[PDB]
Amino acid sequence: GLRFGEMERDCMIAHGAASFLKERLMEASDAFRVHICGICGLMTVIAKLNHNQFECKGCDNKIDIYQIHIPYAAKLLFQELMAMNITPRLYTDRSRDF
């Protein structure tokens, strides 16, 4: 024992203790800062921070963009998915185009 397994997580969910759940299950991986298109939810944004320039060819985007912090292990797992021809669109909005 001395572990924090599925059953322990279920108890914490039942308690509605979400930030403890976040703090506990998260790993070490550096909180990486990526940029994303608001049209396609991909990490295909070219950021010229010093010049305040953000471009996402294929979409003609420079104004519709966001920034998110995610574990580097995520940035990877996603880019790997892109390598396998799969698109993991990340959206900041929950209410789709419906």
Partner: protein, 224 residues
């Protein structure tokens, strides 16, 4: 297997119970919006006993030298005898008690009276009767209008849902139905006066307390 199947069901700010997709599982949690940890087994009196017992307990006929409130239970007891206008109020209450009994006898075809409900009324009263050192000798300074209209107003304040439209308002009347049956049977005029002996002060306290405990009994959105 059980956790896995339900793990994503949560109560939302619209008192609705839904799953990750947003599908409605219950239109209101537990069919009453109440939080399980605030519910206690309580006796729904109106459901048991003979009819003779029911009428003896709840019937108040100001127009009858026999089935009236003795002028000792009440301060305005003698000047209320024969009062027609009040009797119309007391008949709204009694007919409502009679429907309630019918209704309950349908929901619990068995006859079972004790069911977990929120807000332990019997206790709130026992407090009142000790907090206001209520002596069971002197008549009460309560008006029949005090009780009947008071208890009628309290019900409109026991909220689980707030939406201003007709659909949600009905949902709200349903959610509070069983509880109100308990309420009306505990705060029936004859009961208040002859059994509890509440004063206008103790009574007004009992009411606002039930409203407080009730709201404190609703389930909070975000409940897994």
């Amino acid at each position: 297997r059980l956790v896995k199947a339900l793990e994503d069901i949560m109560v939302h700010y619209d008192n609705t119970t839904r799953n990750s997709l947003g599908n409605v599982i219950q239109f209101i949690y537990g069919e009453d919006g109440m939080d399980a940890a605030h519910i206690e087994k309580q006796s729904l009196d109106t459901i048991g006993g003979s009819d003779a017992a029911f009428e003896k307990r709840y019937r108040v006929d100001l127009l009858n030298t026999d089935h009236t409130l003795d002028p000792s239970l009440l301060e305005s007891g003698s000047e209320i005898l024969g009062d027609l206008k009040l009797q119309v109020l007391l008949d709204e209450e009694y007919k409502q008690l009679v429907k309630d009994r019918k209704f309950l006898r349908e929901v619990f075809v068995d006859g079972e009276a004790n069911w977990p409900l929120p807000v332990n009324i019997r206790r709130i009263i026992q407090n009142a009767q000790q907090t206001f050192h209520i002596d069971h000798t002197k008549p009460s300074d309560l008006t029949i209008k005090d009780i009947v209209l008071g208890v009628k107003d309290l019900q409109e304040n026991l909220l689980v849902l707030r939406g201003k439209n007709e659909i949600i308002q009905n949902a709200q009347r349903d959610a509070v139905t069983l509880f109100c049956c308990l309420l009306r049977s505990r705060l029936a005029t004859r009961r208040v006066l002859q059994e509890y002996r509440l004063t206008k002060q103790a009574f007004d306290w009992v009411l606002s307390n039930i409203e407080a405990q009730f709201l404190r009994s609703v389930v909070h959105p975000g409940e897994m």
